Ligand SMILES: Nc1ccc(S(=O)(=O)Nc2ccccn2)cc1
């Protein structure tokens with residue numbers, strides 16, 4: 001069980017102005033800290049944010065949050081469930097800003113909602129330093145789906161935050177799960193992200209912003225474009241046939257030639273974008289998210305599980321014989337890997 005703490009700085013808020021927060025389980029024999037960013041789509045104007053407030057309110061407000069959460073997958077403290085980091089300090093950061101973790105805008109007489117995802121992450125880091133993060137050796141910022149994209153947008157900001165606060169010895173790294181999307185042509189017929197950034201006052205990493213320049217910051221929400229601009233080490237986990245990617249592409253699974261070619265090309269394109277990503281795990285499965293699922297230990301690429309790959313990554317940041325870090329399936333159809341989940 002991780003225990004809830006609402007932010008002491010109550011001006012850093014969820015969408016509706018309630019305080020943001022984090023769930024924490026300390027492990028005082030460990031200098032490793034895992035901060036996990038929850039996912040869950042987004043909203044990009046008054047009308048669809050109003051709809052989200054009616055039926056997804058826990059993603060917009062802390063007023064109904066429970067006082068505890070069970071840690072699962074990479075957040076589990078049991079070695080059998082989490083071979084990688086079972087003895088780490090565990091933090092789960094709820095997603096209540098609806099902005100892919102990019103926003104820096106307060107509620108006001110001009111704004112019905114607050115979009116403060118980027119500031120929530122910084123305030124969580126600040127308050128954790130007084131609860132033991134100051135003695136850390138590694139801070140791993142992880143996240144799934146919208147939280148995986150949030151890792152890409154914020155990992156270098158966390159690294160700069162700790163440097164300027166006077167903690168240059170804490171090594172900041174990122175783990176982005178199911179947040180690596182392609183801005184491809186649909187099977188049947190990015191503007192929402194463009195509108196969202198203006199609505200949220202969204203922020204992107206500075207080097208990426210300077211490449212694409214004003215009006216074009218939406219480009220930095222796509223992993224293959226923002227990743228080359230990042231300085232912190234980042235491990236990328238992405239199913240080659242991600243279900244959220246197929247949903248936005250208007251694909252719903254008797255497959256005929258046109259759809260067969262479309263699906264095969266999508267996998268080839270995703271594999272291509274990961275060619276120069278040295279720390280990555282990309283199986284040929286139809287699925288979405290993995291790292292906080294209890295059976296995340298089950299899938300393998302070329303005989304290597306994801307917990308092993310992450311361990312090999314740790315060793316590489318001190319090629320390794322028998323301990324690979326770049327694991328991308330070459331077979332071209334969903335479930336051509338026998339270890340895919342059912
Ligand atoms: N082809 C394509 C894929 C995803 C999207 S998105 O609106 O959901 N934008 C994003 C971007 C990064 C993370 C999550 N959503 C739009 C178009």
Ligand SMILES: *[C@@H]1O[C@H](CO)[C@@H](O)[C@H](O)[C@H]1NC(C)=O
Pocket residue numbers: 009011012119
């Ligand atoms: C609380 O957070 C806000 C937003 O980041 C900031 O302006 C303010 O200085 C913070 N308060 C304190 C006491 O640090």
